[PDB]
Amino acid sequence: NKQFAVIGLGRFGGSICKELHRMGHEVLAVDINEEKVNAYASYATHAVIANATEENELLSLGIRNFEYVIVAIGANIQASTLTTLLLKELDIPNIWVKAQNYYHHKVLEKIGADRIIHPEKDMGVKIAQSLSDENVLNYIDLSDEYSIVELLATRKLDSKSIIDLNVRAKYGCTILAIKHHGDICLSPAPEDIIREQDCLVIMGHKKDIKRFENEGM
Amino acid sequence: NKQFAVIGLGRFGGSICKELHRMGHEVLAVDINEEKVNAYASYATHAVIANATEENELLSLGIRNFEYVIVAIGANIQASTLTTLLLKELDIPNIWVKAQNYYHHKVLEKIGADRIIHPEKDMGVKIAQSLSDENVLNYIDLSDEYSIVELLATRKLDSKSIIDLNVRAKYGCTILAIKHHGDICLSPAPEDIIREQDCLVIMGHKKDIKRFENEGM
Amino acid sequence: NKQFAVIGLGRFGGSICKELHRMGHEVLAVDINEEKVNAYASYATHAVIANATEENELLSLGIRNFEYVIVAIGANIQASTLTTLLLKELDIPNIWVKAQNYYHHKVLEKIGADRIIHPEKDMGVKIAQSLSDENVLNYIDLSDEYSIVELLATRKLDSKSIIDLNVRAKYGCTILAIKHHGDICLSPAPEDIIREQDCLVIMGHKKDIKRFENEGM
Amino acid sequence: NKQFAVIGLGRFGGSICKELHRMGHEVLAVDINEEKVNAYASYATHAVIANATEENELLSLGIRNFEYVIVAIGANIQASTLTTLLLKELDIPNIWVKAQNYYHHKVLEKIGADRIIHPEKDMGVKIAQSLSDENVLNYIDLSDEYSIVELLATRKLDSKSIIDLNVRAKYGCTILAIKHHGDICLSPAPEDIIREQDCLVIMGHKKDIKRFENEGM
Amino acid sequence: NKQFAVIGLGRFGGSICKELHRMGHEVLAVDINEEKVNAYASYATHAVIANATEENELLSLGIRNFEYVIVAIGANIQASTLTTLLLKELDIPNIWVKAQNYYHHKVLEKIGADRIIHPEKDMGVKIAQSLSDENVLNYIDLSDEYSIVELLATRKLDSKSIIDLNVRAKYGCTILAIKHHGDICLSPAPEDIIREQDCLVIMGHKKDIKRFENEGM
Amino acid sequence: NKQFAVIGLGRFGGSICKELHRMGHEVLAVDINEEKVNAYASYATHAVIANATEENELLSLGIRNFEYVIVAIGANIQASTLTTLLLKELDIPNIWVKAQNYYHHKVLEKIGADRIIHPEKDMGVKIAQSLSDENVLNYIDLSDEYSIVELLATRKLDSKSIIDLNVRAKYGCTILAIKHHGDICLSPAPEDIIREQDCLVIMGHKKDIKRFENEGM
Amino acid sequence: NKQFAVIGLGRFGGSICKELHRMGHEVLAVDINEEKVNAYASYATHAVIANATEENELLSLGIRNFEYVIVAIGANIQASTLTTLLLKELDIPNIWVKAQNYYHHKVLEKIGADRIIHPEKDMGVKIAQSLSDENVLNYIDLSDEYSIVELLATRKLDSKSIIDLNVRAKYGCTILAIKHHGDICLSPAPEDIIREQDCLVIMGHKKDIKRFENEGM
Amino acid sequence: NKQFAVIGLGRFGGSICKELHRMGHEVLAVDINEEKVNAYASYATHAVIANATEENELLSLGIRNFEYVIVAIGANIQASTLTTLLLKELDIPNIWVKAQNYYHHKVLEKIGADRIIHPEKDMGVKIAQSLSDENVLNYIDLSDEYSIVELLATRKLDSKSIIDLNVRAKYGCTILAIKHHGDICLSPAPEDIIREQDCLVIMGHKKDIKRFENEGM
Ligand SMILES: Nc1ncnc2c1ncn2[C@@H]1O[C@H](COP(=O)(O)OP(=O)(O)OP(=O)(O)O)[C@@H](O)[C@H]1O
Ligand SMILES: Nc1ncnc2c1ncn2[C@@H]1O[C@H](COP(=O)(O)OP(=O)(O)OP(=O)(O)O)[C@@H](O)[C@H]1O
Ligand SMILES: Nc1ncnc2c1ncn2[C@@H]1O[C@H](COP(=O)(O)OP(=O)(O)OP(=O)(O)O)[C@@H](O)[C@H]1O
Ligand SMILES: Nc1ncnc2c1ncn2[C@@H]1O[C@H](COP(=O)(O)OP(=O)(O)OP(=O)(O)O)[C@@H](O)[C@H]1O
Ligand SMILES: Nc1ncnc2c1ncn2[C@@H]1O[C@H](COP(=O)(O)OP(=O)(O)OP(=O)(O)O)[C@@H](O)[C@H]1O
Ligand SMILES: Nc1ncnc2c1ncn2[C@@H]1O[C@H](COP(=O)(O)OP(=O)(O)OP(=O)(O)O)[C@@H](O)[C@H]1O
Ligand SMILES: Nc1ncnc2c1ncn2[C@@H]1O[C@H](COP(=O)(O)OP(=O)(O)OP(=O)(O)O)[C@@H](O)[C@H]1O
Ligand SMILES: Nc1ncnc2c1ncn2[C@@H]1O[C@H](COP(=O)(O)OP(=O)(O)OP(=O)(O)O)[C@@H](O)[C@H]1O
């Protein structure tokens, strides 16, 4: 009975609730707009019209029952701030809030929100990376310098071996996976071929990988 | 270098432009809202007030020249749609568009957008995984079943060795990295220690990692 | 049981439904504005308030029953586009859509509308023809060059014969009908008189007719 | 040549002005919306921003000089009405006005408009005929009962001769034209062939043509 | 059973109905605004919310029963015009309409309104007369030259006689009434005194009276 | 001559200014609406854009100089009230204000307006008298009971003599004027004829005139 | 049964009613906005939605029962004025009204409001005093010159005696109270210590106190 | 001298600025509304149009220099909040903010405002005391129980001596001042007379003063 309540059904909030529901958790959907509540009614355990800045409505939902509450209101700063503050004063263990700008972040930080999230901003960065470097499909940064990257293989690697493309010595990186025709190879061994348009998961330093990307592929 | 046009300086569009500019690419920042143009003036090569649905304004920007055009308008479907169409007829190589819902996705597809992105939806899914599992700090899905996961170490893992935690045989998963106090250990050998509250990077099957999480940590 | 549904009750949509009803077909009238639905309630088999961009409402009407659906929404491009797309995905055989401008035409074309109609634009042309040439009551173009025209006869034709006004040799046109005092003569024979203010239906080349209009009448 | 003023650059008004200009007549394009004036600047002799209900602006345009004035305002009854009245008192020869509904028609009639047009309504009727009868591509009504119709030929008509299809005796109707692959056959002789998917132009009584359609094609 | 219906409850319309009711006539109060209908509910025989431009509502009131209908809508020209036209077509014997400007007068005149009234304009004149000439309390014009005026008497007439102030010979006017301390004297005889601040009713030529006003009072 | 300020160029205010200007008095026309200032520019000595509630603007107009100030604002109570107060504190001799309702009258009274006018209300009463009695063209009430009335002559009065119609004895009323075909007969002698459709001017008691109307005409 | 009614529930009005209720008086809460009425429903004897400018609603509340009525509407001048006037005419003994500016004060004064209050303006002054003089916690003016002030004691008074800080001779002021650690001493005697950060209540001339504030503390 | 910035020229903010300026301190008057800047131009050292939430505008005002900044925005929570935060990060010594409700208070507290004021609420309490007790003209609370009160003398107190009214023993309270006809008697001796309608200033316990009021006056 770990209960989640998602306040604000926007694209971000909507997705969290829709997803949490798919996982088979208990989720309460909360939105001031009636139509939204109708929309996500299928995708939550309970859907309720509520003005989340209004304390008595908030109490009527039985919000003190929830371990996690998500304020997925990032356009209306005042609604967002007021709801978060209410939840803090109502002693909610985890208050996760969508933030709009650096300033909205600060107030939320100050009023005691447990996690502040910038979904647009973060993906903006991620896509910009993929934009400049048309080779990066996906990735994850380990630290400021070290990073795991998923790469779409060019024709300058078609049918080449792991040992052929020596990266652990030649480029200081390690290869972790190949994905060919949907089939997946993990921690692939020294003799393994890589074909054009496969998925390649290289791990190392950011600059090291980009080096490899230059002369390698 | 590479020429990029970012039409619509939202929170998502704005990040792309800000980030790409930090990478030092030629970025044209376009918005109909004057104050947005004024806001991102420091973070672009050229920031211009334009109505991106108005064709003559689009030629006045000289958009035909650009390799990549990003429509970061995702609230106003009509603006988004109408612009993408304009850019298509104008023979732009790569048109990447921010989408709002499944149907706005569909029209973009049908008018031939090159890449459609749902930043909020995708991020929603990500955070939702992090919500039901407090241990996962981050992750990347290699495929429907296989995934590389970043985990926050608990007390059950303090002073534990890689050989002690036999993931490679017991769980079919492999550890890739350990982050201790900001210091970073890549593709670490079996003698190495994991201290609590550190970043642990495991790789394997989804159901297999969850298995490790349960009995392991 | 060929069923027609007319979505959007404007002047154009309204007329289609009002007319189709007069013919004794089955017609469903659909408009988001309640008053419109009340208006055309007499002139349809069934009149229903619906927001046609909303799929569940659209399904509740039982729209999959209709062989022909007409989206007579030309001011609101976004409502028009979204409805058409919905209907395409719901596998409607014939989707006829009112278009507003060249661009709205294109998107509709791309999303797979079966016939795009520009009722204002077309009549604008037709009347402009009648405007310059005060003699043309009505007409129909056969091709870019050839055209059937209905003409109001001047005093320079009063009581003249078919043979007198020889057009098949002298002007390369053929006369098809005279309409005098409401009485109608078809394929009128060589001796037939034509009186002032009668209706004359000439068939030929566009330039040929205008020639006739100059020296003839 | 002839002087025309088109007040109200709608989709209907706009077409008149665009078309008349292609014919090379002197067309004054008037609208209260600046952006409309800007849009049709290429398609007129003089395009002016004016409030057509304001009398002094109407003298500043010098409208008394024009032979033909077209009020293409059909949404805003008050603007339409008030303007027509202004033009009447200003002794304009021909005032043609776009009408919205039967009552807006009535006032225009009563304030002495010279020609009232319902472009959407009329076109609605036309398309509706085409809807119930997929064969009719176009048509012109000579009177309440007699009409010239353009038909799309089916398989039942392929390789058929004009003498084979005796319309002149069997159905009281006469064929006027055949269009094959863009090529055009006018007032064709009895030996001529009709191939499927061609344009066929028949003339007669309405009920008679429908009769031919039924058993013939 | 002479029935009156007052459509439009403004200051002017409201007063007509309120007054007609006081006289003990049958009056129907009609206004689109519900509150107005509530207001005049006491002051009419029947008060009904109706949109007077809507024919079926108009028919539901049973408007064809009324000998006199008053359209007391002078701000909204379009509502006024449309209602009047409706009433004309519904064959109402007397249609009295409040007009706003010279143009609104003309259309009403043309569509066949039986009496057009300019309540503001008329009183504006009347008060302006009283303004310049602080002596004129009230008056009524007989023709362009001849006029009956009510006058407040100065100290230069206090205790003077009818014969003393000879106006029928000296000024070509005739005196008709004196009103002293509320008591009224009619066709007052040659010996009658007039005191300061009495009411004096002089009849004659406009210029004649003003002459009297100069040297007399 | 005399200085007048007309604040608020309504239909009522506008008439005062237009009329007073025709009389050739110095009239200052003030309105907050620019287009009103532009409209009455021809009909005043000085027409100025001003917010009459703003004190400094009121000194910039130099209103202290004027003998008469007319507040012809009767829809906007707050504007009306606030202005009148401003003018009072500014020691203006005569403040005449247009009032909307009984309570707006009351405040004006209490803030010391010199004359309060209800043009619509008063005119409403007048026309209402004319409605129930088609014979009364015009009138003036001398007091609660005594009144001078202008009557439209019927068939019952055609070719009738003043001596024949003994009003002075039979009805206690006196005839004052006869208007025949525009020609005017003042204080007419007993031999004089009244022809039908002429203006008749009777004087007496209200109930007495109605009495004459009934049996007389 | 001294009844109070608070019309207008703003911050000021709300506080009056909330407070009067705490005291255990009978209070009627009145606001046009429904939500406000719901808000103060707990904090009044009776809470009622009413438009206070509407007389019949006002009468339905039974407003003639109240000894005191408070019009706590200071933003909307017209609503405030109209309500006050209504209450005057309904013969309410005490009409206390919140005023917005000097002008709104005047009209209220003129229409006979019993007390006019400027809550913002007054506190603005009070705080500005505390602002310049960081030593003044609170105070009360006796007249234009004489004033009782509460003062926060500096380190230049820590552990000093009443006789030590002789003010009745040295500065012409008298000390009335010390407040130390919450404990209160009144009319404190000559030997009494004063510690840093205590509360000191000095009484005298305004200039006298400020003198003391300079060399004393 | 001391530098003060008053952001938001409300009725409360406006008074602070007007008063502080009368005291002759350097006051910067900031508002987003141009007309407010224009209004208080006479009552400040520098009056500037600025959006106080916009950071660059805040540096353009040079706000870092000021010792005291007052946020007198209390309707617009978001503006208020966002500004206070800006000023905090900009290291301003004293930030005094006007608050609207308990929750707007809370955020200000949490973002570290130095003093939060509720001018309406506080004043509401004050007047409410004056309402239930017509005798109290003014007062100051020394603590929860002890208070100095200004009283309006009744008939029961006329010609009464300080010794006659033994408050110091009978009621535990002490009289501090008597105001007679504007003349002022400070810390008055026992022989002194109180005449009716004078200001009386008593000091003691709250319940004790009420006791005196009951039996005394
Ligand atoms: N006080 C409130 N109580 C409950 N729901 C609210 C409240 N205020 C806003 N919402 C809802 O929460 C959602 C928040 O999304 P919003 O419109 O603020 O933009 P956004 O967060 O940038 O959108 P997205 O989540 O797609 O990025 C909306 O559906 C809105 O109706
Ligand atoms: N026709 C247009 N031409 C240029 N810019 C436009 C046009 N229409 C919208 N924009 C801009 O594009 C941006 C798109 O953001 P929008 O407000 O539409 O919602 P959103 O994309 O969901 O927001 P976010 O990116 O923050 O999630 C806005 O900054 C807007 O000013
Ligand atoms: N989503 C919707 N669902 C159903 N009906 C709609 C929807 N959107 C608009 N309509 C209706 O369809 C009609 C469409 O006409 P619209 O106002 O778009 O201008 P128009 O098509 O140019 O007018 P006309 O048909 O006279 O040329 C309107 O009556 C409108 O109320
Ligand atoms: N007083 C006026 N003076 C000049 N132009 C005007 C005036 N009023 C309206 N217009 C213009 O006339 C045009 C009339 O089109 P409108 O938007 O009224 O509906 P419509 O005529 O039904 O549209 P459509 O012609 O596309 O069917 C508009 O472009 C409008 O800007
Ligand atoms: N279509 C309609 N049907 C019925 N009543 C209407 C309609 N349109 C307007 N009214 C009402 O009739 C009244 C007409 O007054 P309006 O607001 O037009 O200004 P006005 O005539 O200048 O005012 P006044 O009569 O005081 O001079 C209003 O009360 C309005 O609510
Ligand atoms: N503060 C102001 N200063 C100057 N002029 C104003 C102000 N407020 C209103 N006006 C003008 O005064 C006129 C008053 O007419 P309003 O529209 O208020 O209704 P009304 O007096 O009932 O109309 P009417 O006189 O036609 O019956 C308007 O022309 C308006 O522009
Ligand atoms: N006619 C009316 N009848 C009853 N209540 C009203 C009326 N008009 C306004 N109110 C209410 O009274 C209150 C008055 O506050 P208002 O919004 O006028 O600003 P304010 O008085 O400056 O606010 P505050 O009292 O906080 O200083 C509001 O809650 C409003 O809803
Ligand atoms: N971002 C901003 N920058 C500068 N000034 C602002 C800003 N936002 C609001 N203001 C101004 O601050 C003032 C604050 O008053 P507001 O109207 O918000 O209500 P209030 O403070 O309750 O009013 P009052 O002080 O009269 O009780 C207004 O004059 C407003 O124009």
GROMACS .gro file of N, CA and C in nm, chain G residues 83-147:
model
  195
 1385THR      N    1  -2.390   5.085  -0.202
 1385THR     CA    2  -2.429   5.011  -0.082
 1385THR      C    3  -2.451   5.106   0.036
 1386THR      N    4  -2.358   5.199   0.056
 1386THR     CA    5  -2.364   5.296   0.167
 1386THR      C    6  -2.490   5.382   0.159
 1387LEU      N    7  -2.520   5.429   0.038
 1387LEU     CA    8  -2.638   5.510   0.012
 1387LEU      C    9  -2.766   5.433   0.043
 1388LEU      N   10  -2.772   5.309  -0.004
 1388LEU     CA   11  -2.882   5.217   0.028
 1388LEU      C   12  -2.906   5.205   0.178
 1389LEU      N   13  -2.797   5.187   0.252
 1389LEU     CA   14  -2.801   5.170   0.396
 1389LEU      C   15  -2.848   5.297   0.467
 1390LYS      N   16  -2.803   5.412   0.417
 1390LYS     CA   17  -2.850   5.541   0.468
 1390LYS      C   18  -3.000   5.555   0.453
 1391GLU      N   19  -3.050   5.526   0.333
 1391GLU     CA   20  -3.192   5.538   0.303
 1391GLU      C   21  -3.276   5.434   0.377
 1392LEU      N   22  -3.213   5.323   0.416
 1392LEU     CA   23  -3.279   5.221   0.496
 1392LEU      C   24  -3.271   5.250   0.647
 1393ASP      N   25  -3.220   5.369   0.681
 1393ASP     CA   26  -3.213   5.421   0.819
 1393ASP      C   27  -3.130   5.338   0.918
 1394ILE      N   28  -3.008   5.303   0.877
 1394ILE     CA   29  -2.913   5.232   0.961
 1394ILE      C   30  -2.837   5.330   1.052
 1395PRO      N   31  -2.844   5.308   1.185
 1395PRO     CA   32  -2.782   5.397   1.285
 1395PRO      C   33  -2.634   5.425   1.260
 1396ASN      N   34  -2.553   5.320   1.244
 1396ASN     CA   35  -2.409   5.335   1.222
 1396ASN      C   36  -2.359   5.269   1.094
 1397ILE      N   37  -2.312   5.351   1.000
 1397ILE     CA   38  -2.259   5.301   0.874
 1397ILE      C   39  -2.109   5.330   0.862
 1398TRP      N   40  -2.028   5.228   0.889
 1398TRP     CA   41  -1.882   5.238   0.883
 1398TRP      C   42  -1.831   5.186   0.752
 1399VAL      N   43  -1.754   5.268   0.682
 1399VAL     CA   44  -1.713   5.233   0.546
 1399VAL      C   45  -1.563   5.246   0.524
 1400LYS      N   46  -1.507   5.142   0.464
 1400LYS     CA   47  -1.369   5.142   0.416
 1400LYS      C   48  -1.359   5.233   0.293
 1401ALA      N   49  -1.270   5.331   0.297
 1401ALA     CA   50  -1.247   5.418   0.182
 1401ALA      C   51  -1.116   5.393   0.110
 1402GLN      N   52  -1.116   5.411  -0.022
 1402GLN     CA   53  -0.994   5.393  -0.100
 1402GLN      C   54  -0.899   5.512  -0.124
 1403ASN      N   55  -0.956   5.624  -0.167
 1403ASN     CA   56  -0.878   5.744  -0.188
 1403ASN      C   57  -0.950   5.866  -0.133
 1404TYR      N   58  -0.884   5.982  -0.138
 1404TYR     CA   59  -0.940   6.105  -0.084
 1404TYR      C   60  -1.079   6.135  -0.142
 1405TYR      N   61  -1.098   6.105  -0.270
 1405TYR     CA   62  -1.225   6.132  -0.337
 1405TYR      C   63  -1.339   6.040  -0.294
 1406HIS      N   64  -1.310   5.910  -0.287
 1406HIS     CA   65  -1.405   5.812  -0.235
 1406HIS      C   66  -1.443   5.846  -0.093
 1407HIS      N   67  -1.352   5.908  -0.019
 1407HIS     CA   68  -1.382   5.958   0.116
 1407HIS      C   69  -1.489   6.063   0.110
 1408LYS      N   70  -1.472   6.159   0.020
 1408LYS     CA   71  -1.562   6.274   0.009
 1408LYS      C   72  -1.707   6.235  -0.022
 1409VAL      N   73  -1.726   6.151  -0.124
 1409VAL     CA   74  -1.861   6.108  -0.161
 1409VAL      C   75  -1.929   6.036  -0.044
 1410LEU      N   76  -1.856   5.944   0.019
 1410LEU     CA   77  -1.905   5.873   0.138
 1410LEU      C   78  -1.944   5.971   0.249
 1411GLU      N   79  -1.862   6.074   0.268
 1411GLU     CA   80  -1.886   6.178   0.366
 1411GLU      C   81  -2.017   6.248   0.333
 1412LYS      N   82  -2.033   6.282   0.205
 1412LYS     CA   83  -2.148   6.356   0.156
 1412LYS      C   84  -2.278   6.275   0.161
 1413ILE      N   85  -2.271   6.146   0.131
 1413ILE     CA   86  -2.390   6.061   0.134
 1413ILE      C   87  -2.425   6.014   0.275
 1414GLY      N   88  -2.342   6.052   0.372
 1414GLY     CA   89  -2.374   6.037   0.514
 1414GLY      C   90  -2.323   5.915   0.589
 1415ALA      N   91  -2.207   5.862   0.548
 1415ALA     CA   92  -2.142   5.751   0.619
 1415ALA      C   93  -2.091   5.799   0.755
 1416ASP      N   94  -2.113   5.718   0.858
 1416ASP     CA   95  -2.089   5.760   0.996
 1416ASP      C   96  -1.941   5.757   1.038
 1417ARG      N   97  -1.864   5.668   0.977
 1417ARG     CA   98  -1.720   5.665   0.996
 1417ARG      C   99  -1.651   5.610   0.872
 1418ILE      N  100  -1.555   5.686   0.822
 1418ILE     CA  101  -1.476   5.646   0.706
 1418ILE      C  102  -1.334   5.607   0.750
 1419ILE      N  103  -1.290   5.490   0.704
 1419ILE     CA  104  -1.166   5.429   0.753
 1419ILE      C  105  -1.069   5.402   0.638
 1420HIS      N  106  -0.941   5.433   0.660
 1420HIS     CA  107  -0.838   5.413   0.560
 1420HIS      C  108  -0.731   5.321   0.612
 1421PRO      N  109  -0.760   5.191   0.618
 1421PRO     CA  110  -0.676   5.097   0.694
 1421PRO      C  111  -0.533   5.088   0.640
 1422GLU      N  112  -0.519   5.080   0.508
 1422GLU     CA  113  -0.388   5.074   0.443
 1422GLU      C  114  -0.308   5.200   0.472
 1423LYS      N  115  -0.365   5.315   0.436
 1423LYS     CA  116  -0.301   5.445   0.450
 1423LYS      C  117  -0.247   5.466   0.592
 1424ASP      N  118  -0.330   5.438   0.692
 1424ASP     CA  119  -0.293   5.458   0.833
 1424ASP      C  120  -0.172   5.375   0.876
 1425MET      N  121  -0.175   5.246   0.844
 1425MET     CA  122  -0.064   5.156   0.876
 1425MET      C  123   0.062   5.191   0.797
 1426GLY      N  124   0.044   5.238   0.674
 1426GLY     CA  125   0.155   5.285   0.592
 1426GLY      C  126   0.237   5.387   0.667
 1427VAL      N  127   0.167   5.483   0.728
 1427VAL     CA  128   0.228   5.586   0.811
 1427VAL      C  129   0.298   5.521   0.930
 1428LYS      N  130   0.222   5.444   1.007
 1428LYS     CA  131   0.273   5.376   1.128
 1428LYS      C  132   0.402   5.297   1.106
 1429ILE      N  133   0.407   5.220   0.997
 1429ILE     CA  134   0.526   5.143   0.964
 1429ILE      C  135   0.643   5.232   0.917
 1430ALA      N  136   0.611   5.338   0.841
 1430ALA     CA  137   0.712   5.433   0.795
 1430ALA      C  138   0.784   5.498   0.913
 1431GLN      N  139   0.709   5.522   1.021
 1431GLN     CA  140   0.764   5.572   1.147
 1431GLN      C  141   0.864   5.472   1.204
 1432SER      N  142   0.821   5.347   1.216
 1432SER     CA  143   0.905   5.238   1.263
 1432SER      C  144   1.024   5.213   1.170
 1433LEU      N  145   1.008   5.248   1.042
 1433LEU     CA  146   1.110   5.228   0.940
 1433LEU      C  147   1.230   5.321   0.959
 1434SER      N  148   1.203   5.451   0.967
 1434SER     CA  149   1.306   5.553   0.983
 1434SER      C  150   1.373   5.536   1.117
 1435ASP      N  151   1.290   5.515   1.219
 1435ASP     CA  152   1.333   5.502   1.356
 1435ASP      C  153   1.323   5.355   1.398
 1436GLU      N  154   1.428   5.278   1.370
 1436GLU     CA  155   1.429   5.134   1.397
 1436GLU      C  156   1.404   5.099   1.544
 1437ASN      N  157   1.402   5.201   1.630
 1437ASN     CA  158   1.379   5.182   1.773
 1437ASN      C  159   1.232   5.175   1.815
 1438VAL      N  160   1.144   5.237   1.736
 1438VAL     CA  161   1.002   5.238   1.769
 1438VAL      C  162   0.932   5.107   1.729
 1439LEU      N  163   0.894   5.028   1.829
 1439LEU     CA  164   0.820   4.906   1.806
 1439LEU      C  165   0.675   4.941   1.774
 1440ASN      N  166   0.614   5.018   1.863
 1440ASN     CA  167   0.475   5.061   1.848
 1440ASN      C  168   0.461   5.200   1.910
 1441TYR      N  169   0.343   5.261   1.895
 1441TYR     CA  170   0.317   5.392   1.954
 1441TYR      C  171   0.171   5.433   1.942
 1442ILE      N  172   0.135   5.544   2.006
 1442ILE     CA  173   0.004   5.606   1.989
 1442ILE      C  174   0.015   5.758   2.008
 1443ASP      N  175  -0.031   5.835   1.909
 1443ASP     CA  176  -0.029   5.981   1.918
 1443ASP      C  177  -0.146   6.033   2.003
 1444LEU      N  178  -0.116   6.122   2.098
 1444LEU     CA  179  -0.217   6.181   2.186
 1444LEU      C  180  -0.278   6.303   2.116
 1445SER      N  181  -0.189   6.382   2.056
 1445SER     CA  182  -0.221   6.496   1.972
 1445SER      C  183  -0.107   6.511   1.871
 1446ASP      N  184  -0.112   6.620   1.794
 1446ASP     CA  185  -0.010   6.648   1.692
 1446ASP      C  186   0.133   6.655   1.747
 1447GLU      N  187   0.145   6.692   1.876
 1447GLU     CA  188   0.277   6.707   1.940
 1447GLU      C  189   0.310   6.596   2.041
 1448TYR      N  190   0.209   6.550   2.114
 1448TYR     CA  191   0.230   6.457   2.225
 1448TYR      C  192   0.197   6.311   2.189
 1449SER      N  193   0.279   6.218   2.239
 1449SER     CA  194   0.278   6.081   2.189
 1449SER      C  195   0.337   5.980   2.287
   0.00000   0.00000   0.00000
